[PDB]
Amino acid sequence: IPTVYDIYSRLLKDRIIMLGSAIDDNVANSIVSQLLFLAAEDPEKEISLYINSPGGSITAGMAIYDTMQFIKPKVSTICIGMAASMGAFLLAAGEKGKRYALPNSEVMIHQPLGGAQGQATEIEIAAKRILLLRDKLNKVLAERTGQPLEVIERDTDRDNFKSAEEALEYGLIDKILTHL
Amino acid sequence: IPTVYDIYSRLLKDRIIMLGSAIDDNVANSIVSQLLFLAAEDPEKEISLYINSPGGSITAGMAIYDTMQFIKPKVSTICIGMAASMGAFLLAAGEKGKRYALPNSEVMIHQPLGGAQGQATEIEIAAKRILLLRDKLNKVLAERTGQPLEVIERDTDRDNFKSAEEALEYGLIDKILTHLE
Amino acid sequence: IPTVIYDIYSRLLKDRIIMLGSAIDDNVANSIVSQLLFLAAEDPEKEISLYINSPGGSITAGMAIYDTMQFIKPKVSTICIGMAASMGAFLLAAGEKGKRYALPNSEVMIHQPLGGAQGQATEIEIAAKRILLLRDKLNKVLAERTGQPLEVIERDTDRDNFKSAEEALEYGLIDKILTHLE
Amino acid sequence: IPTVYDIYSRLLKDRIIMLGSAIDDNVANSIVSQLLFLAAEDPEKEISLYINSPGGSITAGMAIYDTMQFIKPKVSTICIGMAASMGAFLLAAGEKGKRYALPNSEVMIHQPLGGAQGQATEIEIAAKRILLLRDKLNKVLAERTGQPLEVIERDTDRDNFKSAEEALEYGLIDKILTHLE
Amino acid sequence: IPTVYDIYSRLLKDRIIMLGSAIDDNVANSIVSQLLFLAAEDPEKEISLYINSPGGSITAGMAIYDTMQFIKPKVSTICIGMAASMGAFLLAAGEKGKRYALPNSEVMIHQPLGGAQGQATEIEIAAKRILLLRDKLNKVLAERTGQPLEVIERDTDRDNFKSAEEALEYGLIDKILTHL
Amino acid sequence: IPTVIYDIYSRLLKDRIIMLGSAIDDNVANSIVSQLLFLAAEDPEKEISLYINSPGGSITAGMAIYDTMQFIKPKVSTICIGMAASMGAFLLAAGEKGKRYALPNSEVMIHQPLGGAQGQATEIEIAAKRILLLRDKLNKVLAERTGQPLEVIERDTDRDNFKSAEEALEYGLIDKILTHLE
Amino acid sequence: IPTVYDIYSRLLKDRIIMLGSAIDDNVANSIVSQLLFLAAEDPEKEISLYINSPGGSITAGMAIYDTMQFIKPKVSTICIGMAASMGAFLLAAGEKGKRYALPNSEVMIHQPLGGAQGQATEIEIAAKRILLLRDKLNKVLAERTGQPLEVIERDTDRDNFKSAEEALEYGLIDKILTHLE
């Protein structure tokens, strides 16, 4: 980032948030803070969230997600480059009707990844958790896309890569931008 | 973090503290300092503490906890994303009636983790300590939630994960926010 | 990066010039896209110049830049200075047709995508199928930008293909080889 | 931390010093510098030193200690979270009558830790030193607490963990907070 | 570096660029940017490029080189301390007649270094490349020095170290400064 | 290091106070010497105070400080706060005779030089000869500063020698033990 | 390095350059830049270069050296603490008559260090180079000191450590200071 004053900061002035990295507790905390701030400046005006991320932590993602739905402003999402795992999720969380993607953008969805370690009990505790998480997310996706849960389930069994059009068709995005 | 003033700093101007990392001596020291500062600016106005943390050091946590109860202002807590171990604890420490959580927030509670090393004596010294710590915390939770000690004890024997509603039911939060203002 | 005259790269951005002099990854892409978006907001009418000296990078990170370039109103002129390979070469070719330059000793290299699979037969197939489409997708874009028929681009990028400024001009990657600015 | 003026710095403006880390030559040097600075701004006004530290170097600690007793201002200490080894020591060094601690604060005291390496002679040189150090410190504690040396000696043979009340009873703190004002 | 407002920056104010490190994509990018900037401030005034470098990437070097020949201003070069590989090259790229070097400066030239790895084909692809690179550079040197290609070729077979005078004689520099 | 107007240590320098609270190496010496030189340029008349809490350091780095102290016009007062060993102790003793203080529980340790040789017999001899002279050189300086006869300093620094504030006062390292700042 | 404006920078304002580290391409580049800058501000006024360095790269050194002789201003050198290898060299490069050193300063000179690796040819290429370098430097030293080349050669065969006086006698410095101003 070129200190022209942060570049990303000047862009925030026009109500634009840039997510171009993996999603972890830290990134989430920043983006959530940006969202909260924008909502305080003008809870009326729209917000744009560009997304080019490989995914990240399930919780960190939901923090962003909920924050988006929580604030008054409508958050428009634009998948630029690539949006997978939570990244894809967040793209779909954008205000229905304002979820865009560029021509060669790419989108990928899949079931949750995790790990258990310890006693049988402990592992069960973790397996039960992740499974609910999977179920919780799939349901959210169903609403955002329109696909029936059954589909989302079978479709995210393994890495599912989709093109912008394929993404439009599935119900992840609403339109493919070409000129600004 | 952006500089459009430090972002987290501008948010502090509206009396909002952001905890989005593990809790250690350092983080505790920062948040306590923020709380103390806010209390000096206007000991009358409310304070909001967003929480998305995996937990941390028992002592570092209590430092925050006590500081919250100590200052005049009422600290409102909002679990955003995830609050476990001390994180969950702090969420519950928020002014009764103003402890919120978002729809897909998640909350986990459990007994303390630690380690002993050395002579039998030394290990006993540590085992006796941690056990009291566990007991001390559990009692605090009982008050904050309303659950009887017995329950908190049995319920935190091993990692206990709860949804926002499950959290509301247990007495950790008071309401699940969905719309702002 | 010398502090004053404040980032030098920043002062250069003031004259609407973006410098890409490193590999291309999610991070770099994010910065450059941000610069492009910013410039388009300042004056969607004026031209933009993107100097390029990069070894290539992530396919996605690249397309992000690519699409952003085609997306914004301003016309993005590209100048291969030193070296432009993989996505780097690609981006050079994405510059507004007619304003894609390269200096005398610039060098340009193109090739098919690199990647890796790991896991069950299924998983590997999933990856092989993906990369292959990616290759195909990119090759098509190149055909348009260069004028070469897909067939050529395919056979020509089977293995690292190094080209000189002239060879690059001939292939249709650049339009002119700059020599001075008086 | 957050820059809204560094936060720890703004807090120093109200004459408050934050010790929330282990104590080493470096930390000591910073805190001593802060103390000296505050004494130059107004040698009349009180100073507050919040403490949440695991302890540290015996010398680094004494530097702070002496500096506290040296300057004109009276240094009030507040154990927030946890104060052990030198940390505990410093808490006890606070101006008698103004050594506080919050509800769930925790305090631990113990004899010195060290190491020798080399020739018999060299080890003896080190053993003789540390032993005097132990003795020197114990005496200081006796004065600050009121306990007779005999007690301090036997009581710090091995890690001794105390609760806020237990700490009040021993004579380490004077009062336990709860509500500011 | 110390503040004067950076020191290397204040020196840039008098139109002086300092190259005192190896040459890599990054360094090249910085220096090229400095050159472009200076050319925008006053395409009429001269520019001075002090050089004390062990060499670097062939491409990173050429980027600098071409940029020097490309801009309107004349770039004067001064080898201070040591200039080898590309470093030497850049010294020779300075505006003919204004390529200086201090008394105990030292200059070294040599053929390109690189590496191949993989299938016979792949290695051939790399060998063919580097060889052309060598040839390309040698030709550039011939022009800048005046030496016939034949000489440059045989002379750079292995590390060739030259003193300021030896450098003057070869045609790399034009004069050895004593006290400006 | 809390920046507040501005870095704590800097504001303290404004009142002519230098803080040495770390080991002594080429770097630290360079900073402290620079501070001393600066203070001497601001007012070569006014006194300077050098607080010391250091484990010691490089013999040369130390002497650099030492000489600089004796070199400048201002009189440098030293205060051992916490601990002063090896060069640290040395520097404390270098303070203007009469203004070398120490707090109640300060501690001071002195000892002969530490080093290492490596290589040919010759090379090792070169190093052994050097360090020995260094030891001798320093001991002499200490004799003057303390008042103790060389013989004593020699025998007394054969192995780590730890001294209390009083023991330090008695030896002649400090002049008075402070109790009030005033 | 305390920000008063930075100490080293304020010192540069009075035309003083501080070299207190090993000498490498980077340090050389900085010091050269400082020298060039000072020469632009007032090519008439003298410049002082304090030196406390263990030595460094032969080329990095020469860059400084030549730059010193190149600029109009006369560069006065002061060995403070220690000056070895190139460091010693630079001390000797100071304007004859203004090369000082403090009482306990120390100065060490020696022949060049390096390394070869590869084919016989390659090694010869390097051996031939370093040898010329040694010869080149020795000659410079002869001029600066007054000693005949033969002496410098034999005298730097192996690490040669000299005291301030020994340094004065050899012709490296001109006077040993003892009172500034």
- CATH number of the domain that C17 lies in? 3.90.226.10
Q: Which one of G14, G18, G20 has the shortest CB-CB distance to F41?
A: G14
**Distance (Å, whole) CA A62 – CA A78:** 18
Residue with tokens 């830290």: A26
Can you tell me whether residue B156 is helix, strand or coil? coil
Q: What is the CA radius of gyration of chain F?
A: 17
- Chain F residue numbers with beta carbons less than 8 Å from the beta carbon of D72 are 180-182
3-state secondary structure of B164: helix
Residues of F in contact with G105 (CB under 8 A): 63, 67
How many angstroms away from the CA of D164 is the closest CA of chain B? 12
- What is the CA angle D137-D139-D143, rounded to 5? 115
Cross-chain residue pair B103–A71, CB shorter than 8 Å: no
Could you tell me which chain B residue has the CA closest to the CA of A72?
B180
What does this entry list as its resolution, in Å? 3.0
The residue in chain D having the minimum alpha-carbon distance to the alpha carbon of residue F102 is: D66
**Residue the block writes with tokens 């004689």:** E169
Range of the domain at F1: 1-182
For the record, the structure tokens of C20 come out as 């890409």
Q: Do E59 and C83 touch (CB under 8 A)?
A: yes
Verify whether the Cβ–Cβ distance D30 to F2 is below 8 Å. yes
Task: Find out whether B123 and A87 touch, Cβ atoms under 8 Å.
Answer: no
Active-site residue among C49, C54, C77, C86?
C86
Cα-trace Rg, chain E: 17
Q: Name every chain B residue with its beta carbon within 8 A of the beta carbon of D163.
A: 132, 136
Q: E39 and C181 in contact by Cβ < 8 A?
A: yes
Q: What residues have CB less than 8 Å from A30, skipping those under 6 apart?
A: B1, B2, B7
Buried/exposed E143-162: b ≥16 CB within 10 Å, e otherwise? ebbebeeeebbebbeebbbb
DSSP letters spanning G111-165: -------SSHHHHHHHHHHHHHHHHHHHHHHHHHH---HHHHHHHTSS-EEEEHH
Which of these is catalytic: F49, F54, F77, F86?
F86
Tokens of D74: 């009276």
Catalytic-residue membership of C34: no
Interface probe with F: pick from D33, D69, D141, most Cβ of F within 10 Å: D33
User: What b/e sequence results for F118-146 when a residue is b if at least 16 CB atoms lie within 10 Å of its CB, and e otherwise?
Assistant: eeeeeeeebbeebbeebbebbbebbbebb
Q: C53 by DSSP, 3-state: which? A: strand
DSSP bridge pairs for D56: D23
- The answer to whether the CB atoms of A37 and B11 lie below 8 A apart is yes
Cα dist. A3→C2, F22, G20 in Å? 11, 34, 31
Q: Which amino acid is at B36?
A: L
Q: Give the 3-state DSSP-derived string for chain A, with helices as H, strands as E and coil as C.
A: CCCCCCHHHHHHHCCEEEECCCECHHHHHHHHHHHHHHHHHCCCCCEEEEEEECCECHHHHHHHHHHHHHCCCCEEEEEEEEEECHHHHHHHHCCCCCEEECCCCEEEECCCCCCCCCCHHHHHHHHHHHHHHHHHHHHHHHHHHCCCHHHHHHHCCCCEEEEHHHHHHHCCCCEECCCC
Position D150, amino acid: E
For the stretch A42-51, what's the b/e string if a residue is b when 16 or more beta carbons lie within 10 angstroms of its beta carbon? eeeeebbbbb
Given a contact cutoff of 8 angstroms between Cβ atoms, the answer to whether D15 and D38 are in contact is: yes
- Do C165 and C107 form a contact (C-beta atoms < 8 A)? yes
Give Cβ neighbours of residue C98 (< 8 Å, ≥ 6 apart): C175
G148 vs G152: CA distance, rounded Å: 7
User: B82 vs A59: CB contact, 8 Å cut-off?
Assistant: yes
Q: Which two tokens stand for residue A137?
A: 């997310």
Residue of B21, B29, B131 to mutate, interface with D, max D Cβ within 10 Å: B29
How close is the nearest chain E Cα to the Cα of G116, in Å? 12
3-state secondary structure chain F: CCCCCCCHHHHHHHCCEEEECCCECHHHHHHHHHHHHHHHHHCCCCCEEEEEEECCECHHHHHHHHHHHHHCCCCEEEEEEEEEECHHHHHHHHCCCCCEEECCCCEEEECCCCCCCCCCHHHHHHHHHHHHHHHHHHHHHHHHHHCCCHHHHHHHCCCCEEEEHHHHHHHCCCCEECCCCC
Contact status, residue E133 vs residue E58, Cβ threshold 8 Å: yes
Q: Inter-axis angle of helices G58-70 and G120-145, to 10 degrees?
A: 40
Q: Which residues of B touch D (CB under 8 A)?
A: 5-6, 8-10, 12-13, 25-26, 28-30, 32-34, 36-37, 39-40, 43, 59-60, 62-63, 65-67, 69-72, 121-122, 125-126, 128-129, 132, 136, 140
CA-to-CA distance for D101 and B97, rounded, in angstroms?
27
End-to-end CA, chain C: 27
Question: Which of F14, E8, G149, E89 has the alpha carbon at shortest distance from C8?
Answer: E8
**How many structural domains does chain C have?**
1
Please name the residues in contact with C151: beta carbons below 8 A apart, sequence gap of 6 or more.
Answer: none
E11, E21, E159 member nearest G26 (Cβ): E21
Asked if B33's CB is within 8 angstroms of D1's CB, the reply is yes
Whether the CB-CB separation of A149 and A101 falls below 8 Å is answered with no
Question: Tokens 């590989």 identify what position?
Answer: E85
> Which residue(s) pair with D109 in the sheet?
D160
Over its C-alpha atoms, chain A yields an Rg (Å, rounded) of 17
CB A25 within 8 Å of CB A57: yes
**A33 catalytic, yes or no?**
no
> If we measure between CA atoms, which residue out of A69, A115, A112, A72 comes closest to residue A88?
A112
- Give the whole-angstrom CA distance, residue E144 versus residue C9: 30
Task: Identify the residue among F15, F30, F137 best suited for mutation to test binding to G, counting G beta carbons within 10 A and taking the highest.
Answer: F30
Q: In what helix (H) or strand (E) does residue E62 lie, and over which residues does it extend?
A: helix E58-70
* Nearest C-alpha neighbor of F107 from the set F79, F78, F83, F81: F83
